[PDB]
Amino acid sequence: VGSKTKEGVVHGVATVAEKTKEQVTNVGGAVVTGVTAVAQKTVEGAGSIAAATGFVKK
Amino acid sequence: VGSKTKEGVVHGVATVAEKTKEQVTNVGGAVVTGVTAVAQKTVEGAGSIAAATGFVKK
Amino acid sequence: VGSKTKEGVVHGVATVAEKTKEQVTNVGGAVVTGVTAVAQKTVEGAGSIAAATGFVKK
Amino acid sequence: VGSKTKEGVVHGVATVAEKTKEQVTNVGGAVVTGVTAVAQKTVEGAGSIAAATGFVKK
Amino acid sequence: VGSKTKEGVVHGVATVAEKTKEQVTNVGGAVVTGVTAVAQKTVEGAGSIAAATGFVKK
Amino acid sequence: VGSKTKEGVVHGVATVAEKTKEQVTNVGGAVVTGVTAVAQKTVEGAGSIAAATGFVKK
């Protein structure tokens, strides 16, 4: 077989964040912020970085 | 077989963020912000970075 | 078989964060912030970095 | 005076180098290679990244 | 005076080097290689990252 | 005076080196290799990362 396989992998990531401000006001939601490397490998489901699937009575 | 395979992979990502401001007001939604490298490999589901699938009575 | 396999792996990540401010006000939501390397390999479920799936009566 | 002052400064530098080969055969010379951020603030002299001034009898 | 002052400063530097090969054969020279952040603030002299000034009789 | 002052300073430096090979054969020279953050603040002299000034009779 001799089979290499990479599922859902993050390699080699350099980041410099300098004097970044940030402000979040959230109510019942999903929020994702900033420097964001993401590998996903979902099987038989909903892959998703920000998911908001609920009721909010404001 | 001898079969290499990369599913959902992020490699080699450099980022410099300098004096970035950011402000989020969310209510029941999905929000994704900033520098964002994303590999997804969904199978039998909805791949999606910001998903908003719910009721909101503001 | 001779089969290498990487599922859900993060390697080689350098980060410098310098004078980053941050402010979160959350109510019933999901919030993810800052420098964020993430590998996921969900099977038979919803992979997701910020998930918000509940009721909020503000 | 009340003066901010940056002379010769390197801030905020991200780098990913992946499977870079390199081969140098040098004889009496200057060689500079690879990823190279350089701030230089010479006063009353020769600023220079590769300088080669000697004798070479090959 | 009341003065902030940065001379020759390197702040905030992220680096990932992965499977980098390198080979140097040098004879009497200067060689500088790889990932290289350099702040330099020479006064009354020759700033220089690779300097080669000698005799070489090959 | 009331003065802050940074001369020759290296702050905030992250590095990941993974499976880096390296080979140097040097004879009478200067060689500098690899990941290299350098702040230098020479006064009344030659700042220089690789300096090669000698005699070499090969």
Residue numbers in the entry:
A (entry chain A), B (entry chain A), C (entry chain A), D (entry chain C), E (entry chain C), F (entry chain C): 40 to 97
From the paper:
Filaments made from a 1:1 mixture of wild-type and mutant human α-synucleins were of at least three Types. We solved the structures of two Types, with the third lacking the twist necessary for helical reconstruction. The structure of the minority filaments (Type 2, 17% of total) was solved to 2.8 Å resolution. Two identical protofilaments are linked by pseudo-21 symmetry. The ordered protofilament core spans residues G41-V95 and adopts a similar fold to that of protofilament A of Type 1 filament, with minor differences in the relative positions of their amino- and carboxy-terminal parts. Two putative phosphate densities were also present at the inter-protofilament interface.
α-Synuclein is the major component of the filamentous inclusions found in several neurodegenerative diseases, including Parkinson’s disease (PD), dementia with Lewy bodies (DLB) and multiple system atrophy (MSA).
